[model samples]
Target: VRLLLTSFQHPSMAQFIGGKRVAYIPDAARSYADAPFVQKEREGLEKQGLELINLPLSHTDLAAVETTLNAVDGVYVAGGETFDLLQVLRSTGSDKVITRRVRQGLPYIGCSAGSVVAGPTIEAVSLMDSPDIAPDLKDYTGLGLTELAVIPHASGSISQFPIETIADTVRTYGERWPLCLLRDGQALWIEDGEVRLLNLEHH
Candidate 1:
């Protein structure tokens, strides 16, 4: 099962692997917002008998990425701004590699905006409709072939998000991307050919 976790669900997110080892493709934001949390996540994985490998991108790092891909059974595309992941991959020439591996069904997980970009488009702005937002909300390009788009903080109302706003966001898409509203403490796993729901209530 791929884990799409909350911003605060760091170590807990990685430790739920059912005793399997997975590699984290640290984002470019690691030294910034993700470092502190990822450190704990790394600790959790180690305590669970899982190994950790920090990918330091070098001029000749292509072979390293390939090597790690071969070593792990799964990947955690940790939480951060979605565009940052895309930019890092593009600049380092690993974007295509990631796309290739993910399509091969490596069970890569994207939490929050990370998962939002997994679908046909990053329709996240539909939730905000802000014209001055960063990250260039220009297109809905994605790395996923899944039929459903995953939405984070998917409650009917949290702060002031209305049902119609969500509806209009879907309407603006001009294409209906079946959505999985990710309520806090809940996640949807789409694998093989089925979509399953899991909640904290069961674990």
Candidate 2:
């Protein structure tokens, strides 16, 4: 299966947000504010003659999600609030459906929050993603699609986020779980259970 995950909209976005002492997802009003990287992502896929289907999660049930997955060659989930998305998936059992299909043959393209759900646990992201949005969540178990925990935007400044803080956090979760630290333009591609990094340096 192909998994294309990015840290944020761009390096600058990751640099500004990941390096911040406090982690947050902006509440900026919009009908659907596209992630800065989305246009480029769409264009790149189009060059290969591929098109993205917007998965409407708002009114989707598990059956609908499955149908969409079955119809599409790939699913591209854009960036946003990790907790909120996780909660919906967990409640709807869409996570289970997506995991099964990915193993079967469906490709997945995840950005930010979407990528976070692909890991062993979204627990670590609590430090980087807002918790307020998922206040009712009692358990942090993830889909376990991959044994490794993904830490996107690893190239952020160390000053705002001390190396000690970063080290301890990963040591707590990654020492046993393992970690994939991706910078912008970097992606982890898995095919037949073999994982490799896709050097998307120009992204």
Candidate 3:
């Protein structure tokens, strides 16, 4: 099964202690400006024994993904520009790989945009400012089916708004479905028809 994960979805791979061999897809990591954080992420993944697989294919390169998708135990769609990912899906048609993997019952995990994309619509991520390094984008759509949109950096002291603002924004969708405000150690994992929202602080 494919696990469509957000780049920030998991703790250190070493910590989650995933038994399944994982392929790290970080093509969108190209957009992260923090050199050290990015470097640490790569080093950490390698230290945890993850095989780095960069999926930089355009729509024309969709078929090229089959070999990679067919082999991996699951698909981890890391976070990045909402538009960039959608383009990759439309351009390379690699999205079919995602679809196929999901249909095959592959486990999927997502965080940030990874989580945001799987929801009905990703228009909410716009609540935060865009890091607009790449302007060549088409739509604000996401793979929104995961039933929830996560708001990251939700409790940082210096952020522009109060938690109430975030709460209200999420509430706009209706109170039944929660807009998760992930603190430093908080996370959500979906498995076997259940959604588990957690805070690492409790650990």
**Best model per TM-score:** 2
Q: Compared with the true structure, what per-residue lDDT tens digits does model 2 show for residues 139-203? A: 78776666667776666543434456556567777656677776656666655577766665543
Q: What is the lDDT of residue 71 in candidate 3?
A: 65
Tens-digit lDDT track of model 1 for 1-203: 24443422333444454436576665734436544554664565466566655554323377778778767766666555555555565566666676677667666656555565566666554454332333554445666645566665566454544666666665765466666667655665666666667676544
The per-candidate count of clashes, in order, stands at: 1, 0, 25
Better of 1 and 3 by lDDT: 1
Q: Report the number of backbone clashes for model 1.
A: 1
Residue-wise C-alpha lDDT for candidate 3, range 157-191, written one tens digit per residue: 42554566666567664464446666545566655
Residue runs of model 1 more than 4 Å from their true location after superposition: 1-19, 28-49, 56-60, 125-139, 156-175
Question: Model 1 reaches what TM-score against the true structure?
Answer: 0.68
User: All candidates: CA RMSD in angstroms?
Assistant: 4.6, 8.3, 4.1
TM-score of each: 0.68, 0.73, 0.71
Q: Rate the local accuracy (lDDT) of all candidates.
A: 0.57, 0.60, 0.55
Off by over 4 Å in 2: 8-49, 157-168, 201-203
Question: Deviation in angstroms for 147 in model 2?
Answer: 1.0
**Model 1, position 53: C-alpha lDDT score:** 58
